[PDB]
């Protein structure tokens, strides 16, 4: 079976950014439903089970470019009393629909904390080594939910 619209595809992968492996493992996803970064999904289109390959995915087809609007300055009083507010530390605010908005602390200057709401890989080009482990048809429930079980 080939990778295609409405297939649930299982891959084993290694994610490299700038010559360093950042993540490694296995995932399954419903193909053609915006469940996987588009560059990788494009590289997977039409592949057979058992196929292995490498794929370079520029930032625009991966987690997207770095959005300057994602960088903001907030007061230190915005953070929990106990928290260590340091570069790299992660937290979340809430969007207008009540959902979590993760952020990373970028810099702390006295009372001014610069945070970044961007995906940590936004604006980075990715390199994948991929193996297609399994391809199957989605169940109706998976199509209704929009994701692999």
């Amino acid at each position: 079976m080939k990778v295609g619209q409405d297939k649930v595809v299982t891959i084993r992968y290694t994610l490299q950014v700038e010559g360093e492996v950042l993540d490694q493992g296995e995932l399954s996803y419903l193909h053609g439903h915006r469940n996987l970064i588009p560059g990788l999904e494009e590289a997977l289109e039409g592949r057979e089970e058992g196929e292995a390959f490498q794929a370079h995915v520029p930032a625009e087809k991966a987690y997207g470019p770095h959005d300057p609007e994602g960088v903001q300055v907030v007061p230190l009083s915005a953070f929990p009393e106990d928290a260590e507010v340091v570069p790299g530390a992660q937290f979340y605010a809430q969007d207008m629909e009540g959902n979590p908005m993760p952020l990373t602390v970028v810099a702390v200057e006295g009372e001014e904390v610069t945070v970044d709401f961007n995906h940590p890989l936004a604006g980075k080009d990715l390199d994948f080594q991929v193996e297609v482990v399994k391809v199957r048809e989605a169940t109706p429930e998976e199509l209704l939910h929009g994701h692999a079980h």
Partner: peptide, 6 residues
């Protein structure tokens, strides 16, 4: 979107 990177 996947891969989920924390």
């Amino acid at each position: 979107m996947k891969p989920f990177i924390f």
